[PDB]
Nucleic acid binder design. Structure first.
Length: 305
RNA sequence: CUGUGUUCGAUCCACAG
RNA sequence: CUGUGUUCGAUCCACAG
RNA sequence: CUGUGUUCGAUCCACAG
């Protein structure tokens, strides 16, 4: 029984949960989830968590993503994408030059209003369910960050480019906003998530065409997940303790790799096994122990694996 | 269970209570 | 170590809903 | 939140033997 992360590739068409169902089917495993939804009209990297691996999916919410969109100027739909019923389809009269200005004025952070067709909740209900009911909601804007936009290609009302964004950013909203700047509206017609954090589309596995054995070999085990988080090893004797829920004290330790207080770090078994993820109670340099323990606070323990 | 989250058809995953 | 914790003493894990 | 966990799964505290 494997535990870990799978960098899946979702083709255009399937819902993100369809991908999860393909993995549950091929691996004959019930515990599967994803770490960030990709709309049905889009394709690209979709992080999949298997077994105990579902327990570290939360860590993918805070990573940066890189997107390659193509939008059509002068077109507006209800969903903000090509699958939505068209609400308006005018002829945007703008020059490559303004278009260029409007797209790069978004660079830097700004306050983005999420699409009515989204997974946000309003009084216990999904916003895309209320929208199908015809209740179009405009939630408060969220502080978003567009780190950079490159590979811009224009031709007609067809504009495309790549963009690295912060967590919580909707490309569909971005396209509509740029269109608003140009004052004519724009709608996303193709969207490709080329990366989520360190995981790229080049390493993604299309689970729909892969046989169960390769999907299986493709799973990244826990010990190799969240490699961007600082490591920490404990004495091969302290393992059973930790696995029992024992917090971590200076006593039970060994080697560490520096960590700013509050930092989430992964506790290793010095035999390699990942025992748990814990939070830093202080800065790791304070080897000052002329006396007294308490060091890392238990966040998640990987019992039974 | 209730709630929230994730780029929209997670009741299915996560997190909080 | 054994008993009791006065309405299942406190708390940490994990699993389930 | 509500339940579960071979002296508790693990650690404490208060009383007494």
């Amino acid at each position: 029984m494997k535990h870990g992360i799978l960098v899946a590739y979702k083709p255009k068409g399937p819902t993100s949960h369809d991908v999860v169902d393909e993995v549950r089917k091929k691996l004959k495993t019930r515990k599967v989830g994803h770490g960030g939804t990709l709309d049905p009209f889009a394709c690209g990297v979709l992080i999949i968590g298997v077994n105990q691996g579902t327990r570290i999916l939360e860590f993918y919410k805070d990573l940066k993503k890189v997107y390659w969109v193509k939008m059509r100027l002068g077109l507006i739909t209800e969903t903000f994408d090509i699958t939505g019923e068209v609400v308006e389809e005018r002829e945007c009269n703008v020059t490559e030059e303004e278009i260029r200005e409007a797209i790069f004025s978004f660079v830097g952070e700004y306050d983005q209003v999420p699409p009515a067709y989204s997974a946000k909740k309003y009084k216990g209900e999904r916003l895309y369910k209320l929208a199908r009911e015809g209740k179009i909601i405009n939630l408060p804007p969220k502080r978003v960050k567009i780190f950079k936009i490159w590979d811009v290609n224009i031709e007609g009302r067809d504009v495309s480019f790549r963009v690295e964004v912060s967590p919580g950013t909707y490309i569909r909203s971005l396209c509509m906003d740029i269109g608003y700047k140009l004052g004519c509206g724009a709608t996303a017609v193709e969207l490709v998530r080329e990366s989520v954090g360190p995981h790229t589309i080049e390493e993604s596995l299309n689970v729909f065409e892969a046989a169960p054995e390769e999907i299986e070999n493709r799973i990244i085990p826990l010990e190799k997940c969240l490699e961007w988080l600082p490591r920490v090893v404990v004495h091969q004797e302290s393992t059973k303790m930790i696995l029992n829920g024992s917090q971590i004290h200076l006593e039970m330790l060994k080697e560490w790799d520096g960590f700013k207080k509050g930092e989430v770090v992964r506790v290793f078994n010095e035999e390699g096994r990942l025992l748990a993820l814990a939070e830093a109670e202080r800065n790791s340099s304070f080897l000052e122990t002329l006396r007294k323990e308490r060091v890392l606070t238990l966040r998640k323990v990987f019992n039974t694996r």
